[PDB]
Design an enzyme around this catalytic site. Sequence first.
Site, PDB file in Angstrom:
ATOM      1  N   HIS B  41      50.587 -39.282  -9.218  1.00  0.00           N
ATOM      2  CA  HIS B  41      49.133 -39.206  -9.123  1.00  0.00           C
ATOM      3  C   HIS B  41      48.583 -37.848  -9.545  1.00  0.00           C
ATOM      4  O   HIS B  41      47.416 -37.551  -9.261  1.00  0.00           O
ATOM      5  CB  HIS B  41      48.665 -39.561  -7.705  1.00  0.00           C
ATOM      6  CG  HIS B  41      48.980 -38.526  -6.668  1.00  0.00           C
ATOM      7  ND1 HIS B  41      49.971 -38.699  -5.724  1.00  0.00           N
ATOM      8  CD2 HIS B  41      48.414 -37.325  -6.400  1.00  0.00           C
ATOM      9  CE1 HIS B  41      50.014 -37.642  -4.933  1.00  0.00           C
ATOM     10  NE2 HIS B  41      49.080 -36.793  -5.322  1.00  0.00           N
ATOM     11  N   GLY B 143      47.241 -30.882  -1.423  1.00  0.00           N
ATOM     12  CA  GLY B 143      48.112 -30.179  -2.340  1.00  0.00           C
ATOM     13  C   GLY B 143      49.568 -30.125  -1.932  1.00  0.00           C
ATOM     14  O   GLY B 143      50.380 -29.553  -2.670  1.00  0.00           O
ATOM     15  N   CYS B 145      51.587 -32.629  -1.799  1.00  0.00           N
ATOM     16  CA  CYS B 145      52.370 -33.648  -2.484  1.00  0.00           C
ATOM     17  C   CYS B 145      53.353 -33.003  -3.451  1.00  0.00           C
ATOM     18  O   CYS B 145      53.039 -32.014  -4.120  1.00  0.00           O
ATOM     19  CB  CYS B 145      51.449 -34.615  -3.226  1.00  0.00           C
ATOM     20  SG  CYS B 145      50.354 -35.556  -2.142  1.00  0.00           S
TER      21      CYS B 145
HETATM   22  C1  LIG Z   1      48.834 -34.700  -1.867  1.00  0.00           C
HETATM   23  N1  LIG Z   1      48.667 -33.496  -2.196  1.00  0.00           N
HETATM   24  C2  LIG Z   1      47.927 -35.336  -0.824  1.00  0.00           C
HETATM   25  C3  LIG Z   1      48.271 -34.781   0.569  1.00  0.00           C
HETATM   26  C4  LIG Z   1      47.689 -35.735   1.656  1.00  0.00           C
HETATM   27  C5  LIG Z   1      46.360 -35.429   1.894  1.00  0.00           C
HETATM   28  C6  LIG Z   1      46.282 -34.839   3.373  1.00  0.00           C
HETATM   29  N2  LIG Z   1      47.683 -35.048   3.984  1.00  0.00           N
HETATM   30  C7  LIG Z   1      48.502 -35.555   3.036  1.00  0.00           C
HETATM   31  O1  LIG Z   1      49.650 -35.826   3.195  1.00  0.00           O
HETATM   32  N3  LIG Z   1      48.127 -36.782  -0.817  1.00  0.00           N
HETATM   33  C8  LIG Z   1      46.973 -37.702  -1.050  1.00  0.00           C
HETATM   34  O2  LIG Z   1      45.885 -37.260  -1.242  1.00  0.00           O
HETATM   35  C9  LIG Z   1      47.209 -39.213  -1.034  1.00  0.00           C
HETATM   36  C10 LIG Z   1      47.169 -39.829  -2.521  1.00  0.00           C
HETATM   37  C11 LIG Z   1      45.766 -40.469  -2.660  1.00  0.00           C
HETATM   38  C12 LIG Z   1      45.188 -40.489  -1.365  1.00  0.00           C
HETATM   39  N4  LIG Z   1      46.239 -39.849  -0.346  1.00  0.00           N
HETATM   40  C13 LIG Z   1      46.157 -39.950   1.151  1.00  0.00           C
HETATM   41  O3  LIG Z   1      46.999 -39.440   1.819  1.00  0.00           O
HETATM   42  C14 LIG Z   1      44.995 -40.714   1.785  1.00  0.00           C
HETATM   43  N5  LIG Z   1      45.498 -41.709   2.709  1.00  0.00           N
HETATM   44  C15 LIG Z   1      45.811 -43.060   2.224  1.00  0.00           C
HETATM   45  O4  LIG Z   1      45.656 -43.333   1.082  1.00  0.00           O
HETATM   46  C16 LIG Z   1      46.348 -44.120   3.205  1.00  0.00           C
HETATM   47  F1  LIG Z   1      46.114 -43.715   4.491  1.00  0.00           F
HETATM   48  F2  LIG Z   1      45.717 -45.313   2.975  1.00  0.00           F
HETATM   49  F3  LIG Z   1      47.696 -44.265   3.015  1.00  0.00           F
HETATM   50  C17 LIG Z   1      44.051 -39.744   2.543  1.00  0.00           C
HETATM   51  C18 LIG Z   1      42.700 -40.466   2.780  1.00  0.00           C
HETATM   52  C19 LIG Z   1      43.814 -38.471   1.695  1.00  0.00           C
HETATM   53  C20 LIG Z   1      44.671 -39.361   3.913  1.00  0.00           C
HETATM   54  C21 LIG Z   1      46.990 -41.133  -3.325  1.00  0.00           C
HETATM   55  C22 LIG Z   1      47.071 -41.007  -4.864  1.00  0.00           C
HETATM   56  C23 LIG Z   1      47.533 -42.390  -2.608  1.00  0.00           C
END
Ligand SMILES: *C(=N)[C@H](C[C@@H]1CCNC1=O)NC(=O)[C@@H]1[C@@H]2[C@H](CN1C(=O)[C@@H](NC(=O)C(F)(F)F)C(C)(C)C)C2(C)C
Lengths: 306, 306
Positions: B41, B143, B145
């Site tokens: 992503h 960030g 990820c």
């Molecule tokens: C990567 N850098 C981020 C880190 C996230 C954000 C806060 N804590 C973490 O682990 N990962 C993301 O932004 C991922 C990613 C989009 C959205 N996301 C989420 O973690 C979202 N949750 C969900 O999608 C859920 F709960 F449905 F699984 C969020 C709303 C930001 C918590 C993608 C591409 C899936």
Amino acid sequence: SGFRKMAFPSGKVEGCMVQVTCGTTTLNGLWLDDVVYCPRHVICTSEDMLNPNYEDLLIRKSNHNFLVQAGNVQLRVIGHSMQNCVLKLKVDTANPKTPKYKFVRIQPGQTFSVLACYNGSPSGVYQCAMRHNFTIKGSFLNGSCGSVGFNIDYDCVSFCYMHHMELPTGVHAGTDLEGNFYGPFVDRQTAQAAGTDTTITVNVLAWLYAAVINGDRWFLNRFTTTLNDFNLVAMKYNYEPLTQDHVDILGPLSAQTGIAVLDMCASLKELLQNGMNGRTILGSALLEDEFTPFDVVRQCSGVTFQ
Amino acid sequence: SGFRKMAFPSGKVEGCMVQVTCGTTTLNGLWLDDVVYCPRHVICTSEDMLNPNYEDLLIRKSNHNFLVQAGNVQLRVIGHSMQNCVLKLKVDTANPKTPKYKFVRIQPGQTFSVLACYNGSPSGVYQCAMRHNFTIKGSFLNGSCGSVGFNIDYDCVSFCYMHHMELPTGVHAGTDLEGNFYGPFVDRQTAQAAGTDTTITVNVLAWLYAAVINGDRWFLNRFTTTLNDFNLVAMKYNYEPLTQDHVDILGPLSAQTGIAVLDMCASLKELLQNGMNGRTILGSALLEDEFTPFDVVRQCSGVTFQ
Ligand SMILES: *C(=N)[C@H](C[C@@H]1CCNC1=O)NC(=O)[C@@H]1[C@@H]2[C@H](CN1C(=O)[C@@H](NC(=O)C(F)(F)F)C(C)(C)C)C2(C)C
Ligand SMILES: *C(=N)[C@H](C[C@@H]1CCNC1=O)NC(=O)[C@@H]1[C@@H]2[C@H](CN1C(=O)[C@@H](NC(=O)C(F)(F)F)C(C)(C)C)C2(C)C
């Protein structure tokens, strides 16, 4: 989100760990530049542990009597001296992996990461705090002496602890990198015991702030309190008095969450008097005092290190 | 003595962490040899997070569209491919700090250390376990990820996890190093939630063994039980059934302490039915299921790593 007991990355410290052997005793040593730091009881046999004369025992040993291994390479010792409870073995080769480092002496209540090592190799890393009785609740075994505690500031590694011995009730004591013991402890196998340990109040409040950041806000009440009133209740439950310096340190956490420090003290006062009633805060059934306000900020803001 | 949540040394993993930037999105990447692994992503903007077409978005990007920094040095991307949910960016330079590594897919209940990283730099390290709902109770922010979970065998680093997203209730989900998600989770910002999570029974018993090694033996009773009888009580309290493989794995701990596995199960059965009555085991007021039997053996025997 999420809150865990995060320890500092150990990459810089791992490159400084060496194995020091004198006679039959073997333990870990810290290799910074051309000087190796290790506990001074390497020159002691099992019989000397009771009443050692470290100055007397260091007389009878020369440079070649010290065996230092940096992995599979033996380091040639060309000098040795004793400062308090740590040996300074000078080697002909400077460590190429020496990072920007400092020698600091931490105050009780401050946290640091311990790199547990055996035979010069790391076994694991875990965060720990200097309790008010000048001990730590670590995890050490035979041969773990020489493992160091450190803090990392950007690219700077602040060495602040060196493991030396274990006290009753499973607590551990050690010295700074200058060999000075934390608390009234000596490096001999005699009857020693740590004093009464108090709960670090400032760390508890910071840990409560991390709970609010993570959404756990069930413990927040609608009341406030003065510093004096909170401290009087804190004294009953063996909690360290909250000074104005602690309040000022908790400022960034108070500003971020929009909750005054004294308001959080009122919530803590209720928890001390009434308990959690079977509820958990951040998954913990007991109040946690091993998270400094810097740790909460670093963990919740993603502060990285070079 | 002493028992803590020890995490693996992160030195080998730190040398493989790089920063990957595509357009405006920035996250961490794992640099092994001449291939960089990162979540797919990165090619997504904030608008694409809802319903992304990763195959479609990767069409419109070339090698030069990917910005990879290894510290202060930019790595030239000469190829790119997508395997499941992870990108494989081929770079012209092989990482000189690449250790002996393996790509493994762990089973639920197994533990590993997570190196939380932001902008390619490590922020901290903490141990974690794969829960039976295929999630982890980690600590991640924006960030984060690309942060990887790993296990170390002597000189071999077994990469087993890559952070991808956060689920409700503060739990996290991710993939292996082959891009396959752990559990029924997809990398899109939609309504997803983890299933019911059970308590890892084998880890609880191993943690109880560590308590016996450390002297905390108040919970031991004089009774024994069969595997079937213990499991029936375990089902009521949302505990995973104890298979014969789990019993055989707990063998070394049973032999060291002189306590049969089924005898320890009887002690655990009493704790489940009666509680701890305000007492703590190894300083914890709740039973801990994030310590595998290997972790207890490694922690209590001082197993080191090259
Ligand atoms: C990567 N850098 C981020 C880190 C996230 C954000 C806060 N804590 C973490 O682990 N990962 C993301 O932004 C991922 C990613 C989009 C959205 N996301 C989420 O973690 C979202 N949750 C969900 O999608 C859920 F709960 F449905 F699984 C969020 C709303 C930001 C918590 C993608 C591409 C899936
Ligand atoms: C260094 N490798 C060992 C590691 C110890 C042993 C098990 N857990 C640890 O942290 N350190 C020692 O052997 C030190 C050291 C002699 C004895 N010692 C102790 O820790 C002893 N305890 C005490 O002396 C006490 F409790 F009085 F402080 C021991 C009986 C082994 C627990 C010297 C030179 C002081």
